[model samples]
Target: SGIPMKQMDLELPRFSYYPVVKPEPLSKQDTDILSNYINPLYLTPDGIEKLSKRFFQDSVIVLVEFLNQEFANTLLKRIIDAERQPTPMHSSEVSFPWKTAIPPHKHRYLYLDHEEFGPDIILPMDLQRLPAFQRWIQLVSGLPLRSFHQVGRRFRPGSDFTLATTNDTALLEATLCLSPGTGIANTDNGAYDIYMIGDSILLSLPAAWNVFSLVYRDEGVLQFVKYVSRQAESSRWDIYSQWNPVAE
Candidate 1:
């Protein structure tokens, strides 16, 4: 019994991604432990309103530890295992395939297109539209918040990246960081996004597990995801969700 058992990693081949996998509901006995994390200051009377005002003032909410510890930990573990499995997951444990961003110059990465496949594959896309979080976003961002759309993307090591891109249409944007490795400054592990306006840098967000980021974008600002480097141990995974105003 002193020797280690041959059963080292049991669940490597056990991870499955078919039959419309999704997250467990935050209901029943676990109703009180909020699955999503908001600033504690914003839980009191007029706190959310104040947070909304701050959103209007700074136009960004980058909350770390976005999901509660237990929830986020397990969620990230699944993705890490799923991605770790060799590509062309063509077997009994069916995982959805990833689409590539084309042209090579503008962007390059693996992303699950919501438009192409709908919401029955990997990750919990439905969670974004849930009333609790969506309503909170409406209150904080002050957008009409009609519909919700999402993309689960992976910035693979070596050649994945995106050039500076801008948005002409005013909208609210949020990103959930599920990156599997630590980030370093300057370059090397280039799993970060830099938001800039003309000459000034607005924000440079590094990828970290369960760190949710939100910001309002308009004309003249450009943002780009850094190139994931070959030196890195793991690819960067994230869920990007966007919302537009409700039409009257």
Candidate 2:
């Protein structure tokens, strides 16, 4: 099949919230492969350490890609709006978020951390790194950018995740990661809350990697993936809270 132009865009859908539950265990064979795939990508030895610091710490790891302040401002506004006063999401809704950020390159591919381990939500497939990866065709090719919280929330145990508009059952459990190490330039006295100034945010979940094994149960994974596929687009309406840069 020929390369699809529509697939080249970097933009991905932004969901508001998610609700979740526990699942079963994974087989040893599958566990090994999953381990090998995710372990090598750590930004630093401290990468995993800081991610483990938990929320509300000096390392609230998250990364923002795309460096364009204007675009990010617009995009973040759209996401926050939906979050504040969510509307209904229909499958027929225009998926513009996925369309807005297509890369300016060729040879794009899609991947997940460990599909067997519950539709792995580490990176959503569609972003690039600077010096290491120039646009597309880099080490981690078709990966999602910083705004992938919808998928990330699924792994959080007591997290009260939910998508206000769509109300899709599975996506209600989504969770996202925050950047660590070199990615996080803003930290205070070695705490867990992390801060970074960039276009799109990238979060390192090195800490929660192991405990996340509980996330792979078949039924839960299937339901979530199915729900994700059924996502609806934003109304282009304002649904977020205005983020005051100076407030932080």
Candidate 3:
């Protein structure tokens, strides 16, 4: 007999085959196709519009690009010059399961703004004190300022995962890539099987590029499934920023 199908799997129609590609500015045709493809699954005419008008009032993910090559190169140089080292994170931080004596890898962070962590934790200079660093962040996040920012560097292959979580209220979250490779994430619907989970995004980004995302904190959550690093010694690097926005 064929494998028994679960009710959750058939809760809503599943449309297979969405193309995944290297990071590039999405074309207008791509946007339309995506919008049409997604709106129906939720069976709402204004579903995509609602998401767009609320989260990206002034910005569109497709229209956004890197802060330009010169800025990107300079930013990269500054980060390296700072000699910042990331602090290892606990497996429990993302609820990753590990075998005995083998903990999660690829969970290190260098904070750009946090009240608790000190400057000496990584480099000699205080990054928050640097003008260029602040400018780079502002350019990348498309915001005048941000409350906090951090870069997640995954050096190894063992564990690259994040649980479904939300940020604090009054903040909009933006994630960007500082290196090659892709990250997979799902917009959590509170339950997971297949159908109810709908579709997940395979975020492939180029250096110094970002995509807009909104988080209401109390309203919903976005769950990162995994981070796929590039081959041998080329770990995945990404930036996570949270900006305080006055409105949705």
Candidate 4:
């Protein structure tokens, strides 16, 4: 008799093929698609007015702690490993034991979870290192003709909250203030690493997605999630997790 269907060998969804259009070459001028489309709207008088009317009324925050560096390192490794897969856009889809609806063109937004090379916008600096960070410098040096503004910076410590330090150039940690003159974040604003808990880093992002609010924090090197708030905690995130580190 034939083997049971449920027990038959099956390939997971990770290796399935999907259509992907080449990401338009990112421009360093007003021609950048993200800028050409979105910046005009934000700079318009009506846009500012709408922002004041809509987003300025309140604020939201979230917190997560790994409790130890081992946990942190384990998580970071998993995210890095996934990114290391041989996908078209430096992406990976590890074999899975279950089924789910996989989204399309998702690797573009995940700098921390996957090693796909683009720009790191979600993080402020490298966690293990201090006085310098990858995402921080990347934003500053990668600015277009315009520069960003120095909005707000925060990292307060009082015993219960302490920051982490590192010497690696690949890690991103902390908070910073960017140039406010041209609207694109330049390299000369004040940048800092707030590895310590309780020190929340606030960011004024320049993105188009009706995304007016966000919160980000680290878990060593494993996983970090971003939250968008609209009266309730929108737990939307770019989560990357695996069991290899735990097994190690």
Each model's TM-score, in the order given? Answer: 0.72, 0.21, 0.38, 0.20
Report the lDDT tens digits of candidate 3 across residue range 1-248.
Answer: 66775334321111121111222233455434333322232113353344445444544242233334444455456445432333234544321211111223322222232222343232112332234334332333344543444333333223344344444454444454444222222212111111012145323233222222333222233434243332222333444444543344
> Candidate 2: how large is its RMSD?
19.4
TM-score of 1: 0.72
lDDT of 4 at 91: 30
Name the runs in model 4 displaced over 4 angstroms. 1-39, 60-85, 88-223, 226-248
Q: Global CA lDDT of candidate 4, please? A: 0.24
Clashes of 1: 0
Model 3 stretches with alpha carbons more than 4 Å out: 1-65, 75-155, 167-170, 181-218, 229-233
**Lowest summed lDDT over 10 consecutive residues: which window, candidate 4?**
153-162
Q: After superposition, how far is residue 157 of candidate 2 from its true place, in Å?
A: 30
TM-score of 3: 0.38
Candidate scoring better on lDDT of 3 and 4? 3
| lDDT tens digits, residue span 132-165, model 4 | 1112222222211111111111111110111232
RMSD over all Cα atoms, model 4: 20.2
User: How far is 209's C-alpha from truth in model 1 (Å)?
Assistant: 1.1
Worst 10 residues of 1 by lDDT: 12-21
lDDT of 4 at 204: 31
For TM-score, the strongest prediction is 1
Which prediction has the highest lDDT against the true structure?
Answer: 1
TM-score of 2: 0.21
Model 3, backbone clash pairs (residues 3+ apart or across chains), number? 0
RMSD each, Å: 13.5, 19.4, 16.2, 20.2
